[PDB]
Amino acid sequence: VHLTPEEKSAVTALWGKVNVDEVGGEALGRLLVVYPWTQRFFESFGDLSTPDAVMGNPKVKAHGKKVLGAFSDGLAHLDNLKGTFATLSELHCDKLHVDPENFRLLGNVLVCVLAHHFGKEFTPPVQAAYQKVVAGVANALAH
Amino acid sequence: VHLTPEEKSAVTALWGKVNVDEVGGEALGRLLVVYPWTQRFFESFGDLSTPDAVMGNPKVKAHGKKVLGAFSDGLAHLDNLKGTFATLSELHCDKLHVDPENFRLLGNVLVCVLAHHFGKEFTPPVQAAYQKVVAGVANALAH
Amino acid sequence: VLSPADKTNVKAAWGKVGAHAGEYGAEALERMFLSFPTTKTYFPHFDLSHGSAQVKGHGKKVADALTNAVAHVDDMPNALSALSDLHAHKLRVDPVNFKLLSHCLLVTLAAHLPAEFTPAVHASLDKFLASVSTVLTSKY
Amino acid sequence: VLSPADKTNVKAAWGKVGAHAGEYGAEALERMFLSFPTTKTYFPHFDLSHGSAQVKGHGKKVADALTNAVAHVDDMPNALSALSDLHAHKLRVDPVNFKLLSHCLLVTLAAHLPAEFTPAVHASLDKFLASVSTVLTSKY
Ligand code: HEM
Numbered sequence: 001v002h003l004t005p006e007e008k009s010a011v012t013a014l015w016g017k018v019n020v021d022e023v024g025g026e027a028l029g030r031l032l033v034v035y036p037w038t039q040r041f042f043e044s045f046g047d048l049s050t051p052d053a054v055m056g057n058p059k060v061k062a063h064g065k066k067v068l069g070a071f072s073d074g075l076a077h078l079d080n081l082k083g084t085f086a087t088l089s090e091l092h093c094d095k096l097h098v099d100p101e102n103f104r105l106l107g108n109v110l111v112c113v114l115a116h117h118f119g120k121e122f123t124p125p126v127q128a129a130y131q132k133v134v135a136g137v138a139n140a141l142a143h
Numbered sequence: 144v145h146l147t148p149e150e151k152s153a154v155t156a157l158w159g160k161v162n163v164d165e166v167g168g169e170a171l172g173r174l175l176v177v178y179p180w181t182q183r184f185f186e187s188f189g190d191l192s193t194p195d196a197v198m199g200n201p202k203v204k205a206h207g208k209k210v211l212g213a214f215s216d217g218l219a220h221l222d223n224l225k226g227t228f229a230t231l232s233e234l235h236c237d238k239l240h241v242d243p244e245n246f247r248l249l250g251n252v253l254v255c256v257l258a259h260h261f262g263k264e265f266t267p268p269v270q271a272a273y274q275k276v277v278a279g280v281a282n283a284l285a286h
Numbered sequence: 287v288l289s290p291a292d293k294t295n296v297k298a299a300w301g302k303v304g305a306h307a308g309e310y311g312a313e314a315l316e317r318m319f320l321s322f323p324t325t326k327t328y329f330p331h332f333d334l335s336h337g338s339a340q341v342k343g344h345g346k347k348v349a350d351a352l353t354n355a356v357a358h359v360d361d362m363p364n365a366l367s368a369l370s371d372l373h374a375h376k377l378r379v380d381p382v383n384f385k386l387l388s389h390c391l392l393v394t395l396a397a398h399l400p401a402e403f404t405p406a407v408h409a410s411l412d413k414f415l416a417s418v419s420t421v422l423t424s425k426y
Numbered sequence: 427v428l429s430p431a432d433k434t435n436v437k438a439a440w441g442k443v444g445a446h447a448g449e450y451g452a453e454a455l456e457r458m459f460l461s462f463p464t465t466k467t468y469f470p471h472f473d474l475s476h477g478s479a480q481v482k483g484h485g486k487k488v489a490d491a492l493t494n495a496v497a498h499v500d501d502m503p504n505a506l507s508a509l510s511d512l513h514a515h516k517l518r519v520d521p522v523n524f525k526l527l528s529h530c531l532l533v534t535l536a537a538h539l540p541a542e543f544t545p546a547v548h549a550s551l552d553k554f555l556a557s558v559s560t561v562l563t564s565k566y
Pocket residue numbers: 038041042066067068069070071088092096098102103104106107137138141
């Protein structure tokens with residue numbers, strides 16, 4: 001997917017300020033709380049019986065980093081999201097059998113997390129740019 | 144999208160038997176009846192106040208042929224659905240502002256119409272093959 | 287939610303389906319598993335081959351749930367509460383899968399009821415199944 | 427549909443939002459129009475530029491509808507019936523657009539309520555908006 005220069009600018013500037021140790025975990029965590037069927041894919045992660053349990057869960061946080069890792073890799077290759085997410089696609093689609101709609105949901109949760117973290121700075125234009133990005137990732141994953 | 148040889152065989156054999164003057168109109172018609180918000184895109188078509196009105200509407204039938212025309216073109220180019228639907232994509236997305244989910248719905252309605260028309264012959268394997276096809280078209284349109 | 291005409295239309299289709307209900311439910315399941323393979327992971331312990339006794343037995347259960355829903359169409363939340371609990375809480379069935387099975391149930395009726403699957407009845411059945419699906423995902 | 431905790435959580439967020447409700451509704455609308463441009467075709471006669479009086483006025487209407495919904499949370503179908511009629515029958519609003527505006531309403535709350543937008547409250551607000559959306563598409 002192609003971002004305009006201003007779109008690219010909006011995404012890049014904000015992403016530099018992202019705590020890559022934490023935002024991933026907050027997004028995955030929220031996904032599991034907000035869309036609890038997604039918990040079916042993480043029975044090995046231990047206690048997911050409460051929101052606090054999910055959020056504080058070290059494995060959720062740890063795994064969130066990898067997600068965000070993939071998202072960062074996505075931002076670096078906007079013109080080749082297909083090739084970039086090739087392997088993650090095979091993993092989620094053919095081994096994990098995650099429905100692609102859940103990629104869209106995780107993307108939207110990420111956007112909510114960014115809004116939460118940056119407040120006013122997460123302006124409607126900035127949001128519009130990020131929606132393009134998480135849509136691109138989701139579709140790349142879904143190929 | 145790639146169909147296996149058996150998948151391709153299942154699609155091709157059935158599609159040869161399709162009344163290309165009618166099935167398109169039945170699919171578009173049903174879409175407008177079953178998902179009535181889609182009627183917003185066809186205010187120029189006249190009477191859509193009843194199911195019978197929609198189905199009997201000459202403009203619905205006429206337009207359904209073009210749809211089916213595009214679908215037939217899609218079946219002919221399974222390996223290049225992207226390039227094939229390039230122009231239809233710009234039309235629906237950038238001029239018509241149809242939400243892509245509606246492509247999926249029209250595809251699924253088409254499948255219901257094929258099942259209706261061919262009964263037992265529309266076997267679960269045959270259906271599975273057609274779902275691959277209408278998914279490919281929808282995603283091509285949505286690019 | 288459902289109109290009186292909808293309720294009338296759904297009752298009619300049910301009536302014509304008759305004692306094939308179980309067989310049709312099993313067919314819809316097969317159609318879903320073949321067309322949408324991600325759905326199969328909810329049934330790891332099923333044999334999902336054609337002619338599977340387990341798919342047949344399960345198809346009857348589905349059909350019976352749907353019949354109970356039309357039989358209590360004005361109070362589906364109450365009628366389907368235990369099944370809602372089962373699907374959302376225990377099985378954690380992804381809401382998107384309900385649209386997939388609903389579509390295959392429509393396809394299965396279409397392929398078996400030439401006369402009854404009119405545009406109007408199609409629309410009514412779709413709404414009926416969307417309402418059933420809403421209830422069964424309502425513990426989300 | 428909504429749990430007591432959900433109802434409690436939604437009430438709390440509403441309370442903190444306070445008299446900003448109208449402004450936040452207008453912001454959510456802007457976010458939707460920018461992020462999902464297909465939605466703009468429902469408002470051909472609106473000026474949808476930033477700071478538009480029409481978007482502001484409309485945002486207040488939205489907010490007020492949502493406030494009426496939480497104020498009558500145990501009977502949203504009744505409370506929202508006229509709006510359901512309007513959106514489905516008259517405006518023929520595509521159901522998918524309700525998920526888009528719901529998401530932007532969540533984003534808008536998130537960007538304004540650091541303290542209140544916890545995971546639990548997030549989950550409750552999402553369910554609340556999905557329920558509102560269900561009602562407003564219930565004439566489908
Ligand atoms: C939408 C964007 C997504 C991204 C960028 C993403 C990325 C990743 C990454 C980087 C890994 C680790 C891969 C590895 O260990 O080599 C992973 C694993 C996994 N993901 Fe996601 N994912 C996404 C969506 C989802 C969703 C929505 C679900 C479930 C609801 C899911 C379920 C899983 C599971 C069960 C694993 C297992 C880890 C393993 O076996 O190593 N994924 N994903």
